[PDB]
Write a protein that binds this ligand. Structure first.
Ligand code: HEC
Ligand code: HEC
Lengths: 128, 128
């Protein structure tokens, strides 16, 4: 669906920026930079779960040229990248579910598992 | 949560782009420009309904200044802006519901209802 590679790059970048902003606000609440607010937290978790469904589509074959932080490795090992992306989506969905209840230990664990998705994928598939 | 006002503008622009990509795909399928897949159409409608809740947060005071197509009018008439935005969130949700059926007439009308809200807002609050 992308007319040029730049548009696929822009799409996936835009989605991850949105993900980072919303995910970071949950982080702030759990790290103690701001008080935990259950209502805002659940909006952020819902946002991350919905946004997680977006960027995969932008990783079109060979779009490692130009203004992208995606590595060529993505398309060398695309099944592994896809496995990570699916796990991330599933993690984000579990965080959204956890945010609908009061149990803080369950939220905190769900958040950690989702955060590990980010780091694990970036380590292998994103420029430093 | 924006570190600088440019960030708020980039956030809302990024969201609108994602909305446009998904809504545009849906309209291509309704207008004969690419093959129709009801499952894809539905999940795009769910993307739009989730995304529709994202850009409002970026419309912070003073962010008519910067690299933006938002008009100063937004902040004079923010009640009206917010009424249009919530109505958009509502109509995007309604399109997502319609997309769970095979009632093509109802889907076409839901899609038009959502399109009208894009235009209605842009006509008042976005630069030409
Ligand atoms: C692979 C399965 C990934 C997962 C899971 C997550 N990210 Fe990521 N992200 C990935 C790549 C390959 C890229 C580069 C995209 C490009 O074309 O440049 C990114 C990029 C980001 C960015 C920067 C976006 C931008 O403005 O250019 C951010 C802020 C980011 N990613 C954050 C992020 C977070 C917080 C995640 C977990 C909640 C996360 N990503 C997961 C690959 C993958
Ligand atoms: C007001 C309540 C709006 C509704 C409803 C919709 N949009 Fe809009 N949009 C609006 C403004 C004020 C702006 C300018 C943002 C800025 O800071 O420049 C926009 C912008 C867009 C864009 C351009 C994004 C970019 O890359 O800069 C697109 C593609 C866009 N809007 C599309 C869009 C669609 C398809 C909508 C309905 C499904 C829709 N918007 C609704 C205000 C509002």
């Amino acid at each position: 669906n992308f007319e040029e590679p730049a548009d696929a790059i822009e799409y996936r970048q835009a989605a991850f920026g949105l993900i980072a902003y919303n995910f970071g606000d949950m982080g702030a609440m759990l790290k103690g930079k701001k008080p935990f607010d259950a209502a805002v937290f659940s909006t952020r978790a819902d946002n991350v779960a919905a946004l997680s469904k977006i960027p995969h589509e932008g990783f079109i074959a060979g779009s490692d040229k130009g203004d992208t932080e995606a590595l060529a490795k993505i398309w060398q090992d695309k099944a592994d990248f896809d496995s990570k992306m699916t796990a991330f989506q599933d993690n984000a969905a579990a965080l959204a579910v956890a945010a609908k209840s009061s149990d803080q230990n369950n939220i905190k664990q769900a958040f950690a598992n989702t955060g590990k998705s980010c780091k694990g994928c970036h380590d292998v598939y994103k420029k430093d």
